[PDB]
Design a protein around this ligand. Structure first.
Ligand SMILES: [Ca+2]
Ligand SMILES: [Cl-]
Length: 264
């Protein structure tokens, strides 16, 4: 029912005001005792990718057909990482692929902390994503902080969330079949119009998901105790109606920053 079901609406009347760029938007006074991770955080200034911090594509996933991840689709302009979608000449991509999109993967691994990103969605039928994942030694889990396609006009007022356990050994959940727990919420604004701030407070006890500083989901952390990498990308997905449109593929997915904090 997650295609139709808005569990609730998200109220922004009491959303926190921006006071500083040093702590999470949901905790601007730092009641949680955060320290900024200066290795992993990226304000995306300048003109070139920091390839010491990020892989320029996804070395382990070519992409969901028909969209193929490519390095050239990611540039850096006006203090933002900019991801675009292209359609190369016919026959240029491997079989089944027709368009290209950007993808960045963190070289650092993380387990627990605060993770925040300021994103301006692309107004095109490509899912835009800020998420975390690891598939390692028969343990494969994923936290889908942001996986949305407001570029499909039918999804403009949706805010999705999901967490996945693709596989887990006997002592870490004993999961042999993929399981996930999606939930959608209603937001009063069209998502693709402006920048918005996605936040994740990830602890051994809970996964807490925030939008523009407002808590909108709490999950009991029963399975997500595996170190994960940060992923930023565009991709195709028929479930969101996110299939290429040659007459609407000129938009830009903008990432202003990615910030990471640790405790103590
Ligand atoms: Ca920036
Ligand atoms: Cl902001």
């Amino acid at each position: 029912s997650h295609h139709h079901h808005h569990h609730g609406s998200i109220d922004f009347s009491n959303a926190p005001k921006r006071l500083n760029n040093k702590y999470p938007l949901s905790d601007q006074k730092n009641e949680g005792g955060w320290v900024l991770n200066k290795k992993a955080s990226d304000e995306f200034k300048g003109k070139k990718l920091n390839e010491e911090r990020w892989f320029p594509n996804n070395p382990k996933w070519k992409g969901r057909q028909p969209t193929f991840f490519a390095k050239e689709n990611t540039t850096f302009e006006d203090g933002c990482c900019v991801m675009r979608t292209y359609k190369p000449e016919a026959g240029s991509l491997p079989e089944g692929y027709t368009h290209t999109a950007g993808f960045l993967v963190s070289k650092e691994l993380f387990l627990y902390g605060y993770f925040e990103a300021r994103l301006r969605p692309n107004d095109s039928p490509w899912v835009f994503g800020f998420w975390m994942s690891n598939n390692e030694r028969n343990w494969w889990t994923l936290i889908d902080i942001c996986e949305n396609c407001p570029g499909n006009p039918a999804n403009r007022h949706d805010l999705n969330s999901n967490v996945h356990v693709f596989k887990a050994p006997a002592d870490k959940g004993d999961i042999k079949k993929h399981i996930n727990f999606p939930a959608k919420y209603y937001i009063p604004f069209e998502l693709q119009k402006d920048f918005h701030v996605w936040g994740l407070d990830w602890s051994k006890e809970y996964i807490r998901l925030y939008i523009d500083g407002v808590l909108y989901r709490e999950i009991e952390n029963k399975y997500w105790h595996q170190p994960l990498r940060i992923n930023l990308n565009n991709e195709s997905n028929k479930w969101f109606g996110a299939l290429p449109d040659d007459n609407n593929m000129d938009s830009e997915y903008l990432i202003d920053y990615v910030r990471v904090w640790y405790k103590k």
